[model samples]
Target chain A: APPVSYGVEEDVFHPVRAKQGMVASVDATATQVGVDILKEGGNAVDAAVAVGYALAVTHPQAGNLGGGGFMLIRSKNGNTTAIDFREMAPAKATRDMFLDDQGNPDSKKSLTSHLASGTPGTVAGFSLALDKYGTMPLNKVVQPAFKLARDGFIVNDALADDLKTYGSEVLPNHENSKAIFWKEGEPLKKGDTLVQANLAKSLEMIAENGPDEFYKGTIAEQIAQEMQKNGGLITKEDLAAYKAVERTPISGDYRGYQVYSMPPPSSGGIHIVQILNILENFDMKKYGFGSADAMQIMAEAEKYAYADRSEYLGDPDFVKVPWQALTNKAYAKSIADQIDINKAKPSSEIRPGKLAPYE
Target chain B: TTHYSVVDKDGNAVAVTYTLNTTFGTGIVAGESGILLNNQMDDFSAKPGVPNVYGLVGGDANAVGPNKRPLSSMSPTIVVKDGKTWLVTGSPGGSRIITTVLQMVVNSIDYGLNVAEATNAPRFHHQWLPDELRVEKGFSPDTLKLLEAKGQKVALKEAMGSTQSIMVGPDGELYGASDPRSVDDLTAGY
Candidate 1:
């Protein structure tokens, strides 16, 4: 076998796996749930939905029902699209909602309170994904999460570490935090079987009654009561009005391979496209992995792309971003020209490039 | 943050990355829903020119408003070659997520590394804000010095992001790797 370059350092800790149908994730159990779905003949989208729900139970720190995220799907036939299930501000949300009495931004209130919550889009997003592209029924895809929630999963070191790290900031904010995440009065230790019967029931209701059960029905009612009792902005109306829009995936080419990612509202896609455009100017292979030249060039591209991100990238429905010009090869060349590959430019010195000419 | 990349036997791929912003997200589970809500509203530029928890700055384009989605750095990505899914990848590290996926793709495609090699390779991340370049521990001191000489403010973090990736061969074989940053990260298949 020709020198197999696995690309990592000589002292390897984790080995990669090669198989027929694969699922890789932050959690082993959740990844296995996805693989099992594929093994049972579910398509990639179905497996993804299952993994999403399963992670909600197994990895609560990031996996969420109260939160929202974006999903990018590529059909076997090569048709690609993105589902924007990203949480949206409630209808009552205002531009300066997080401002303090002095009109200055209040990081404390925006980061830690019920008032910071958005109308969640996970159920709606997953429902739309399964309905339009997924091969399995919602119930089938969601059952593993329900089982994991009900029967419980052992807490891993990572989860335990997160609980320890963020417990002080997170635990005191909610009344039920102790009951939900803690093992008695303390943070959960590794190997503890974490269970949430209520979460299981919630998943069950969602599976049986469909997404509307949560968005407009009983779950919505419960959420509204909690929001009203607290100072949350979400209302049943927001839940009812929520819709996960399907947006076209952003595409860019890099070294002959076509790259596809989520569009704006996700700075990731736009910046990734922009960064790659600048990077395309360099013959990266010659710099070798982890070389100073490679790192410096990539960082410079990132600075340029991110400067644009801070200025122009936002929800397309609201902002008139220079999407075309930002992703244009001509614009990339303009930015790349600013880079002195031999020396890094201080990020503070950079600004969003003028794209009108390229546009 | 959690990410999962799935590639079925048919070459279909899905890269789904989701997050609760910070741990346990708002630390609040809603009534009877058992759902942990996001502090994603904070992800909005709380004020024009102000930085969020991740030290990422934003402008009016990302200000909070009715029915508006907050700006995100989650880069769920898929790469296709010859009209087939070649690589499926995504990650969860707030601002670092985009760069992590970007580097993985560059490593695999441009550098000719296998899925394992591409994912396991030590990486560096730069997110315009905070003006710091973060490299993982294994970076050579020579490279670190080189970066500093170029006026880069370099910091060595334990790790940048945990990426989960899958590379699909034309013959239908799937190769998967998980970041070692998280002890529980893993890949499974049949």
Candidate 2:
């Protein structure tokens, strides 16, 4: 290892074996579980499903069964699609739900309070992907997470750090959460065995009865009961009505490679293509990586793309995004023409560009 | 905060990025279910045209409404070349996820860096909101000065997002790189 410096350390390159399959994640435990599934003849989706469930048990801070997220998959034929299982605002939720008496948006109410939770769609998301794309059954993919939850896993420094940082603000809000996340009123430290018997049972039930049990059965009942006791708005109907949508993956040509990503609900894919499109006019390689010239050009593109995100991007069901016009290279060139390569424009100076002409 | 990228030998790939919004998320474990609910509603505009916790501005499109999914910056990406999987990657950062993944793709494909170099490179993010360019520590002072001189509102931070990536090199060998900034970041395969 080189001497520690302010700059990034020279990375130690590890050799990779080009074999039947591979898995890499934030946690070694979850990654290992996924690799094992792949080694057992599970395809990419099967491994992904196993890894998703394992992460819920092992990487609680982010990997979750109670929350929802997006997944992008590419088949061997090069066709790709995205699954949007993002949490949805419950039916009872209103525009002013988080507003205070003054009608100002109470960010505190929106973020930390009981009403902050949306209808979770992770179960639906993962199950749908598995059913459609996976070679293994839901039970097979869920077993690892169930075992980890029942038997317990050792806490790592990463999980411990997050628990310590947010425990005081988070754990005491719910008794069940307090018991599982904190040890005797203190956050669990690295090396401690963390167990969740209830979660293990929940996983077991889901494995046996499938995702429907979670969205429409006992799990749904429990969630609604908790929400009713608290100030939350989610009901059994919200869970029962939740469905993961399979959307066409947004795609654009960048350099020589075809890039694809999720549309509408995710700002990532559009902005990525938008930025790349604007950047196409520049010779980034000549400026060198991280050079001021390179940074300036990229930042300029980001501003234009994000400006469009603020004005137009949203769930397609809710709003009609001008996707074609926004991603069009000609529109990109219009924005690119506004950039002074040597100067960085203030974000305030940038706004969403006119796409009507392109539309 | 968890991201996993996997590719089977057949070149089938999957990139999943999930989050709890906040670390413990709303701090409430759902009833007997023992599931930690996401505070992802915070990802939405609490009020029309207001910025959420992530400083992302929103309008009616992202306003609070029934069954609307809030906008996200999570980028689970796969790059295909000539109908084969060339790269698979994603990351976990609030608004920085998109930029970090973008830089990684550019580093590998544009600058011609290998997986390790691409993943380990110093990254920067500019989200148009807050109006500043945030870069990871290790950038030369001269670079920052030049960026600022170029009208960039330059800010420095100890680190940015964590990227997990797997690259298939031209020789057909798989190269894996886990984010060095994260404690348990790892890349493993058969």
lDDT of 1 by residue, A1-359 (tens): 12233334563443355556888999889988998899899998899999999998988888888888889998888899999999889999999999989999887778788887888888898999999998889999999999999999889888888888886578655767677777677888888888998899889999999999889888888788888988988999999999999999988997678999989889888888889999899888888788989899999899888888889888999988788998899899988888887788887789888887987
| CA lDDT scores, all candidates in order | 0.85, 0.85
Q: What is residue A270's positional error in candidate 1, in angstroms?
A: 1.2
Native interface contact recovery, all models: 0.84, 0.79
Q: Estimate each model's TM-score.
A: 0.96, 0.96
Q: Can you list each candidate's DockQ?
A: 0.69, 0.61
lDDT for A28 in candidate 1 is 85
Candidate 1 i-RMS: 2.4
Question: CA lDDT of B2 in candidate 2?
Answer: 64
* Tens-digit lDDT string for candidate 2 (A72-134): 999988779999988888999887888899888887787777799889888999999999999
Which 10-residue window in model 1 chain B sums to the lowest lDDT?
B28-37
**Would candidate 2 be rated incorrect, acceptable, medium or high by CAPRI criteria?**
medium
